[PDB]
Design a protein around this ligand. Structure first.
Ligand SMILES: COC(=O)c1ccccc1CS(=O)(=O)NC(=O)Nc1nc(OC)cc(OC)n1
Ligand SMILES: COC(=O)c1ccccc1CS(=O)(=O)NC(=O)Nc1nc(OC)cc(OC)n1
Lengths: 349, 349
């Protein structure tokens, strides 16, 4: 179950740009304390890990963590069971896992001065935002309130601390530059499949419209829907009659139609309510967000696409959280990903 | 050369604490934008990756990156050659690599507000520091000035972008909390060997004084010297007759004497001058820092220890930078680490 045979493995940095401070660098002057004087800084580069099996079969997979996460979530579950990285190397795919710009081993662009500030220029905001444990508990649908689990939950109970410890803030790097890094990676890899999650869902869709090497997308519980510009459907507010879901991302129709040329699957876990739930904001948020994604997939299909929505309970998997790939049944979730890859020949050479 | 067979691999979080915001969390209220209200935040936890060979022998190795770095530097070289992780799994050791608190996949403690501030409390400083490409070039002795290489250089020339992209800032987490996280990892692992680098040199020495499971230390180009409290020898200023090296860390002699109970090796690369070099600040800095370390090792040996200094040129390896384990001859550098492990019985069951 745990053994892994790698023809090769490693990591590298890709993407990003440079910014420079004022003045010149004099090697005779004290280098420490570090100074912006004469400085070149590499910023917004992304970290990439790869593991290649012996005799790979089919396209490499690029696993793209959700918001505030890192490639760790594809390596192991919080209770230490194998993650999708191991599972799909065993399934004979070369596997890439990334830490996007601003997360984990990706760059956090800060310098000598207030966070994110290079002299008078603000590269990212000094004021940060970050979810609490409580916010993440309900966002991920462990249960309706912090410390409470749904009866059917597939969460690895007892490993809560390990789970929340993987989560953190993201600096205000432009989403354009995050997409740019992954487009450059896709150019480097060749034909591949993007496997996204939550906040990276919309980013992966954007990458596909810029990179024909993306031959398929599987998105686990994507957080932001995408529509052709000017063509966002009517989407209701939340049950509290004042909140809304994340504003849908709009792209030019000519780019949106590129999503119709590849197989795309959105995967949702359990315990998303069918009816308005004003008492549980993030449960109600998921209800309307999943609805919006269903309309997004229909728009892709009306343009000739191959887009589908997989509710895991309809496949007989009950209780999954918003991280199905680290839940107790993640081997069965991986089986369904293998099925999708096989259906579209993405597991053949 | 690149093939690797793993009995198991994965990653996990360990260490850290929690801090809390005021008030109570209400799941019916909008969870986004994120708020400190009723918040629990997990801070200062550390990321740990492991790869175990089939039929391990000897003690697991814990590779601990230098300042502003991550476990990446043990995975691959900037030009994509295998790092010590792969080399020592092939050498049949279980290999742990860490991203320490504040670096990479370790936690960066920040919240909703100015960087590092939780309401009125400063958890880490809002003002950051970070080396430039230019400062790192001379710090790591690629050459005497940015753009220049020493004649004998083992640096992977042409891969400067990859190399400097792996580097970044560290928030002002207390070193005590970084040491604490690794003490907990060492407690979890059992008897093990610490392999440190630059900034983690002094931190690994401290870990060993709190953790009898550390059975050996190899430190690559450590940045801060350590002495018993009140017994810091006279150390000269730098050639500019105004700068000093890093203030030596002082610990109680009852803890310092624990360093005499295990084999300890400091490894230095090439192009550290023998004579004062006022034109090249960081070259002179290394001259005096290496001298201070030589006095540190002597103090350990005067307490009955087995502490040695290995200059790679004396072993016939020329041109190494301050990252010998990612230089072009890093296989030969690894051979010398294997020799150390073998001599001291750390490669035996
Ligand atoms: C696993 O975590 C996620 O990636 C996730 C999952 C479910 C719902 C939302 C998210 C992303 S987040 O919770 O981190 N959102 C966030 O920080 N604020 C925020 N607010 C917006 O409203 C205008 C728009 C926006 O676009 C990404 N992000
Ligand atoms: C690979 O990089 C390193 O770890 C390294 C290598 C050689 C020299 C120094 C370092 C650490 S650092 O350069 O990042 N130092 C730093 O930010 N300032 C700073 N100043 C101090 O005394 C004034 C004390 C102090 O050690 C805790 N660090």
């Amino acid at each position: 179950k745990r053994k892994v045979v790698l023809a090769e493995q490693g990591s590298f940095y890709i993407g990003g740009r440079t910014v420079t401070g004022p003045g010149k660098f004099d090697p005779s002057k004290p280098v420490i304390p570090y100074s912006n004087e004469g400085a070149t800084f590499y910023i917004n580069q992304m970290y990439v890990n790869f593991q290649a099996p012996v005799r790979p079969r089919g396209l490499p997979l690029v696993f793209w963590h959700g918001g505030g996460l890192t490639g760790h979530i594809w390596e192991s579950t919080p209770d230490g069971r194998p993650g999708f990285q191991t599972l799909f190397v065993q399934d004979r795919h070369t596997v890439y896992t990334i830490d996007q710009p601003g997360r984990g081993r990706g760059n956090i662009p800060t310098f000598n001065g207030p966070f994110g500030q290079l002299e008078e220029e603000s590269i990212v905001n000094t004021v940060t935002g970050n979810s609490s444990k409580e916010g993440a508990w309900v966002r991920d649908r462990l249960g309706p309130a912090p410390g409470q689990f749904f009866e059917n939950s597939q969460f690895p109970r007892g490993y809560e601390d390990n789970y929340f410890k993987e989560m953190g803030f993201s600096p205000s790097i432009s989403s354009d530059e995050i997409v740019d890094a992954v487009v450059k990676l896709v150019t480097h890899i060749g034909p591949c499949v993007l496997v996204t999650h939550a906040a990276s869902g919309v980013l992966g869709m954007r990458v596909a419209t810029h990179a024909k090497n993306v031959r398929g997308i599987v998105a686990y519980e994507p957080a932001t829907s995408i529509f052709p510009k000017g063509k966002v459907p009517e989407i209701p507010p939340l049950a509290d009659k004042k909140s809304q879901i994340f504003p849908p991302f709009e792209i030019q129709e000519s780019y949106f139609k590129k999503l119709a040329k590849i197989p795309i699957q959105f995967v949702f876990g359990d315990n998303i309510p069918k009816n308005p739930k004003s008492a549980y904001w993030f449960l109600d948020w998921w209800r309307v967000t999943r609805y919006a994604h269903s309309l997004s997939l229909e728009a892709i299909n009306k343009l000739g696409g191959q887009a589908s929505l997989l509710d895991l309970p309809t496949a007989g998997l009950r209780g999954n959280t918003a991280f199905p790939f680290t839940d107790r049944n993640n081997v069965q979730v991986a089986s369904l990903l293998s099925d999708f890859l096989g259906k579209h020949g993405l597991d053949q050479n």
